[PDB]
Amino acid sequence: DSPVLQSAYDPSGQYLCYVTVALDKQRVGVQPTQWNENFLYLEDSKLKVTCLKWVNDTVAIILGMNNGEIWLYSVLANEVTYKFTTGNSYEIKDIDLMGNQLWCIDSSDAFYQFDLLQFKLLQHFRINNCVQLNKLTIVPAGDSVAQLLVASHSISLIDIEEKKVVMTFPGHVSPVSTLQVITNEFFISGAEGDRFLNVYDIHSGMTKCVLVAESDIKELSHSGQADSIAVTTEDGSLEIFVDPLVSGNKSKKSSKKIQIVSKDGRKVPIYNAFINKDLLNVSWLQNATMPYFKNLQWREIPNEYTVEI
Amino acid sequence: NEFPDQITTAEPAPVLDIIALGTVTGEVIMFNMRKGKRIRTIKIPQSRISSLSFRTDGSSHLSVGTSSGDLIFYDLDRRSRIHVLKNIHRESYGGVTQATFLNGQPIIVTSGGDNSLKEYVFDPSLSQGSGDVVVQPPRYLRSRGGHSQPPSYIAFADSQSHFMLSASKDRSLWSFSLRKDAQSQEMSQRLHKKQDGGRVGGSTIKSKFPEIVALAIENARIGEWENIITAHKDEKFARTWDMRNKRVGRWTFDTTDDGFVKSVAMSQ
Amino acid sequence: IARVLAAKAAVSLRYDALAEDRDDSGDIGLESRAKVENRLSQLEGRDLRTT
Amino acid sequence: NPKAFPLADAALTQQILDVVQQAANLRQLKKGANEATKTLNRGISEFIIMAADCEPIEILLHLPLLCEDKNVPYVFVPSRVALGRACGVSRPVIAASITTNDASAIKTQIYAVKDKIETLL
Amino acid sequence: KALDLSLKEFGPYHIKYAKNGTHLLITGRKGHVASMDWRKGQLRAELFLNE
Amino acid sequence: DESDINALTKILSTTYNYKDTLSNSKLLPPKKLDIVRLKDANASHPSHSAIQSLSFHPSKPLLLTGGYDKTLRIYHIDGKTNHLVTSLHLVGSPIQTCTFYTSLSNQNQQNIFTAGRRRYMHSWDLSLTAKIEKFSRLYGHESTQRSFENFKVAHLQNSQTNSVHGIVLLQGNNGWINILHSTSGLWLMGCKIEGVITDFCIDYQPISRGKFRTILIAVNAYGEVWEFDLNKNGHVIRRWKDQGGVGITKIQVGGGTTTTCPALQISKIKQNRWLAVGSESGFVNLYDRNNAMTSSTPTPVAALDQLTTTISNLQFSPDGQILCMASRAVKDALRLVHLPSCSVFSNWPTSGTPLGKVTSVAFSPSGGLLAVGNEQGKVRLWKLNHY
Amino acid sequence: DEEDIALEFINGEKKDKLVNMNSFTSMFDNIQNVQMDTFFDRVMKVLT
Amino acid sequence: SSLSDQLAQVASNNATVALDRKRRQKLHSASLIYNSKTAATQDYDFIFENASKALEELSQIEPKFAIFSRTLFSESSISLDRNVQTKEEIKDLDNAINAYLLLASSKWYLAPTLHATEWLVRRFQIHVKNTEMLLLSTLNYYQTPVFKRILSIIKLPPLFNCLSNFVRSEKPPTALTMIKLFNDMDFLKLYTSYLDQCIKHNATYTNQLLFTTCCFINVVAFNSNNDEKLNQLVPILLEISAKLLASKSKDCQIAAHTILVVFATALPLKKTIILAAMETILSNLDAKEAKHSALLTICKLFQTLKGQGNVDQLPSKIFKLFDSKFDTVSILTFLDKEDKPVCDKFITSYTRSIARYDRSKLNIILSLLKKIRLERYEVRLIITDLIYLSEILEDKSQLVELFEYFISINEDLVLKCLKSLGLTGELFEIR
């Protein structure tokens, strides 16, 4: 099992920002993905982070913590720049930005808007029929701050100016874990504990395809045009679906399977890969905490691949 | 007049035209509609008052149900606290939502949002002469209860279609009835002692089990030995229970291969 | 109490039989009396009838 | 402590407290002042060690008189809590007699200690 | 003295005081027969039956 | 009845919790510990002998483990899991005691000092195969080291220039304790007491800003101890007798800084308050050192006798609040005492805890982790909720 | 420096004297016919 | 439900009536002086006339009994029956017996009081029906043949049910079973209602206050390591510590002081209830022993504070009250006594508040800081407030006197405090 609690790749695959535990603190860190180690701890065990996301004009991380704050934290400088807050001490479960517009859900069902250029709160609101929340995503249609997608155990496409639910998809039997928009209309979703990804149209509510993998998933990464989606599975393998929006008619099996076996016969796990156009950034824990990488050529390797180290 | 904070709950008192109001902060204010005034106020600070009720058996008690999970009985003939009651319903699902007396009767009925419903009887007083100043704490009584989260697995215990087993998602196993709901009871996770003469396995502190994925059930030799078995979330073994004694059986079975258990079944 | 008072009688007795500088005021005498007395009280204060 | 006649030195105190530790290991001693005088009267004691740390010293120095009558060796040690922790009892004892068993496993160190005690009178 | 010996698990009761006003004898239609003092709490013969 | 010296009655009617339960205490609540288990620290990689020594890195999250199976592992430890980082294996030689060492000046040395029952100790350097050195040369005094079976590691500022360097300190055979040089390996001096050296511990005390003199305290096997400073040459500056105590077996000082929690800045040194000498009859005397300064025959502030058999390992909390007694003889033989009020913690070490035949115990420097290594070849890891 | 301030705060804390089961069963012998101030400083003697 | 239960109800409801000669002799041989074979032949006028002599002796030693010789010990009271009248009259006679018993609870070392109260034991049947006022009015004399006689005569009410193995047994019950009787809180509420009725009638005396104090400190000692039971047991002992402090006698005053100090050392209370208990024990200080006892409880009760605020400023509305009831003088003499009880945290909060709220008598803070020993974070905190004081007002000579004292001892601490705030050159330029 992983001692990396949670990790996030930067866009265009250069730096992995990962938070692990180190004697009831939270060793956060940034690692280049071609030696960066002097990165911070927070104070005590009751201040652990809950979500994190990149922002690419400087480059920085946002850490949605559990005490009730968001921490805008630089990377070149080591200190935290700003501490966004709500008025409540409730646990932020997910954060997502779009340009300047930031949006964080709570654990007490609220929604908060923010902006990382004005550094203040905008709207502080809840809605009915969303009784838990653990994912949200602002949709890409340019500067479309409207029509965001919240997700917990069923997915609710909700407006920001009509301010109510406009469509409701069936989710899973578990709380959702991965929800990401891959086109201007399609979004992939998948809970934890189950091996089933389902992609949804945003305008019809019809489950177009179901992707399957040989295990339950941990994190997905799609390309820039939704033609390759690589998930990392809980048994430490990498499953890449090539061209997942064509027509083996309703439920696509996994195409590429990369797992990493060292030259003594010991399987090492893979967490949080990243696939842009024709590369693959496989990451794995060599020692107990310090991760290593590999830039694998993606489209030319065979259907299965035991990477030796 | 304009009240300083949001009066979130109310109930009409059995004395003539006074109404009890509970604020968002901890103040019970007793408004008097005839005089247009307030009569008294009592404070339960840094706590959210969620329900009010009044005892109507001749004696005068008040019952605040505060949404931190707590339930207090005030006595208005002495402005005192008879007894508190800590964590009837859990705070996360809302705490005590509605907790009423019954008209003339010294029993209260409490229900939260975590699928519990209990009733609590006041004893008659223990000192024969003084009486109404030594009031016993309220005893537990009949209760009904679900398990606050949607169930993960469903089984039917007997061939009679009488009792079902629900494996929940709050890491709890319950036996529910189908005829009339008097016997909905949790199977207690007090592990039996290992038969070697030595102490038990597992946690000494009563934390509940892992999440319960898949179970299996038959009625072939009930009561003579362990009846049902189950398999938990990412747990290296699969453990049994007993349908008759309604608790965990002795022997867990390891899978002896260092893997998670996913599919249990039993011979008929 | 006969055993504990015999033991304290042995203490006091051999002290004031073997010392050659005492002031004959009975100091460890009434000290041992106080110790025997609260020993007696804290052993009679038990009640072997289950209350 | 002027009436405390012979009390041992540092090294002799250490070696007799290690031999009384081994005596308590092998269960070959009787501890306490009244038990010491009992075993002295019935005449089994190899030697007597006594602690010159109690608020009367006359609680123990009555057994020197019959100890001199019966020619047994006897020696003082400056710490009764040391006697307790070396004899294996959670209370501070005063005196300890070592009983006689020629079929022991510590006979030779007991006898060497006995000579080192009877040499200083 | 103004008693109420309210019993519900046996049927519609029936009274007979003694010749002097001391003892009481009650009878349920289900099976209950109780002969008892009533100014003193001295239940001296209770008997259930099944007829 | 109404239409509306009474102070505490009115506020009894106001509130209904009656302890300052929160983080506004900064002290351990006596006679009631608050402690949770964690995952087994030896789960990702099994051991094979008795865990003879545990330690922590004084800044990094590394728990170092070594035993009689002639290997030494170093885990990276946290709550849900813990993994192995490296695991060096020395053939031929067991390791009776092995410990971290970071230099005080540069904080970029990270040596491991591992010694067994043989004559050599091994020095590992850590900067991320890997090399080691074999300290095996007593210079002038070879007939005074039967073995390197017990050692300690301590800093020293050299008192005419501030060249702070480390020192290992060895148990002798007659009455000796040699010190050495941690980096080079020169002899520096050897002090000596009479009887048998049984154990010893290292005090520090500051003198001015950025300047400190260390003190080696060493016990007899009888109970009179010698404390001599060694920032000058090692001659005795005080010698005092334990009030009682005969067969004493371990001594540990601390409360300030010591081997289980050193500093990294030089001026973060601190004079150790509590001292704890523990016998073989189960008894533990503990003194303060603000009334036992020049008394030359001080009184025990506490005389615990709570555990029965012969004690081996007694450690402190890194801020000096919780002593840990641990006797390596019988099963389930560890206790924790609340040190300022010298009470004994009642609720935790109960029979529903799988301590086993405890043979090493070690505190974390800042997380409040508590590692206990037993004889069966594992180490369990509790966490104290207060720290 | 703040860690040194907090560690000095928790070092500067003297030995309290607790209460336990039979801490005051000795009062029931000299309970009878004693002035209240003598009982009070006797209790303060048992505490301190 | 159970007919046997519904009949035992009327049995205990009509125990105080005689319906044959055997029950009459069983209800009449219960007497407080004589045994059965003599008390079973006593006509009522005999015990009435010797009890009238007993009441006259008690009246000429105590002047509040002529009202009873008028009313309840009258000549017609030998023909007044108990259970033939109406319930309003039985309630009036009930609290008449209650008034008599808690008036004559302090006289039970006297044969006149025994022979006086024997009459209404024999006639008004208070050995059966007004039972608990008798029991917990004469509970304090538990090592006495009069209490063994009371306990053999009476039947036990269900609260006192752990005395029931001392009926017909010639050993008097023990201190440990008295504490086991005081342990369960549903006896404790009843005893506290008795105690505050006795307070408001103002009959509190130095034997039953002693007994109540020793029972409360042993109950607290029994629950010393039971956090839940102590948390449930605070608002009984504390609430009647309050309405015992609201009285006037020095005995009950320092008895409340004793239960307060033992409860504060039993568990660490909250800072606000320590402050309010200090205001309560300080707003009603009258006598001489009350001063010394209140000072000792303030010092110890304020010392037991392990957490921040423990050396903070005590507020003004209680600080000027402390300055009123206690002078700054004789605080010096309590400090100058030899045994020196531990008072460091209260002395520190006293110094911080005399620095921040009076700022005109600093020779006093110099003197008491010179004559007490002090701990290091406390002296750092008071010199931090002293630097705040020295930069809010002008540097007078007594201010620089105690500052040069704080220079002459602990140079490193005052320099570290000034390194936290500025520079010693600017400080010396100020002074």
Swiss-Prot record, chain A:
WD repeats lie at residues 13-43, 44-83, 171-210, 212-247. It comes from the Eukaryota. It is found in: Nucleus, Nucleolus. Belongs to the UTP5 family. Involved in nucleolar processing of pre-18S ribosomal RNA. Required for optimal pre-ribosomal RNA transcription by RNA polymerase I together with a subset of U3 proteins required for transcription (t-UTPs). Interacts with snoRNA U3. Interacts with MPP10. Component of the ribosomal small subunit (SSU) processome composed of at least 40 protein subunits and snoRNA U3. In the absence of snoRNA3, forms a complex with other t-UTPs. This complex can associate with pre-18S ribosomal RNAs. Present with 33100 molecules/cell in log phase SD medium. This is U3 small nucleolar RNA-associated protein 5. It comes from Saccharomyces cerevisiae (strain ATCC 204508 / S288c). The gene is UTP5. The chain holds residues 2 to 330 of 643 of the full protein.
UniProtKB/Swiss-Prot annotation, chain D:
Signal peptide: none annotated. GO terms for cellular component: box C/D methylation guide snoRNP complex; nucleolus; nucleoplasm; nucleus; precatalytic spliceosome; small-subunit processome; spliceosomal complex; U4 snRNP. InterPro entries: eL8/uL1-like, H/ACA_rnp_Nhp2-like, Ribosomal_eL30-like_sf, Ribosomal_eL8-like_CS, Ribosomal_eL8/eL30/eS12/Gad45, Ribosomal_eL8/Nhp2. It is found in: Nucleus, Nucleolus. PROSITE patterns: RIBOSOMAL_L7AE. It comes from the Eukaryota. One of its GO terms (molecular function) is U3 snoRNA binding. Pfam families: Ribosomal_L7Ae (PF01248). The keyword Ribonucleoprotein applies. One of its GO terms (biological process) is maturation of SSU-rRNA from tricistronic rRNA transcript (SSU-rRNA, 5.8S rRNA, LSU-rRNA). Binds to the C'/D and B/C motifs in U3 snoRNA. Component of the U4/U6-U5 tri-snRNP complex composed of the U4, U6 and U5 snRNAs and at least PRP3, PRP4, PRP6, PRP8, PRP18, PRP31, PRP38, SNU13, SNU23, SNU66, SNU114, SPP381, SMB1, SMD1, SMD2, SMD3, SMX2, SMX3, LSM2, LSM3, LSM4, LSM5, LSM6, LSM7, LSM8, BRR2 and DIB1. Binds to the 5'-stem-loop of U4 snRNA. Component of the ribosomal small subunit (SSU) processome composed of at least 40 protein subunits and snoRNA U3. Belongs to the eukaryotic ribosomal protein eL8 family. This is 13 kDa ribonucleoprotein-associated protein. The lineage of its organism: Eukaryota, Fungi, Dikarya, Ascomycota, Saccharomycotina.
Swiss-Prot record, chain G:
Signal peptide: none annotated. It comes from the Eukaryota. It is found in: Nucleus, Nucleolus. Involved in nucleolar processing of pre-18S ribosomal RNA. Required for optimal pre-ribosomal RNA transcription by RNA polymerase I together with a subset of U3 proteins required for transcription (t-UTPs). Present with 6560 molecules/cell in log phase SD medium. Interacts with snoRNA U3. Interacts with MPP10. Component of the ribosomal small subunit (SSU) processome composed of at least 40 protein subunits and snoRNA U3. In the absence of snoRNA3, forms a complex with other t-UTPs. This complex can associate with pre-18S ribosomal RNAs. This is NET1-associated nuclear protein 1. It comes from Saccharomyces cerevisiae (strain ATCC 204508 / S288c).
UniProtKB/Swiss-Prot annotation, chain H:
The modification N-acetylserine is found at S1. It is found in: Nucleus, Nucleolus; Mitochondrion. It comes from the Eukaryota. Belongs to the HEATR1/UTP10 family. Involved in nucleolar processing of pre-18S ribosomal RNA. Required for optimal pre-ribosomal RNA transcription by RNA polymerase I together with a subset of U3 proteins required for transcription (t-UTPs). Involved in ribosome biosynthesis. Present with 18200 molecules/cell in log phase SD medium. Interacts with snoRNA U3. Interacts with MPP10. Component of the ribosomal small subunit (SSU) processome composed of at least 40 protein subunits and snoRNA U3. In the absence of snoRNA3, forms a complex with other t-UTPs. This complex can associate with pre-18S ribosomal RNAs. This is U3 small nucleolar RNA-associated protein 10. It comes from Saccharomyces cerevisiae (strain ATCC 204508 / S288c). The chain holds residues 2 to 432 of 1769 of the full protein.
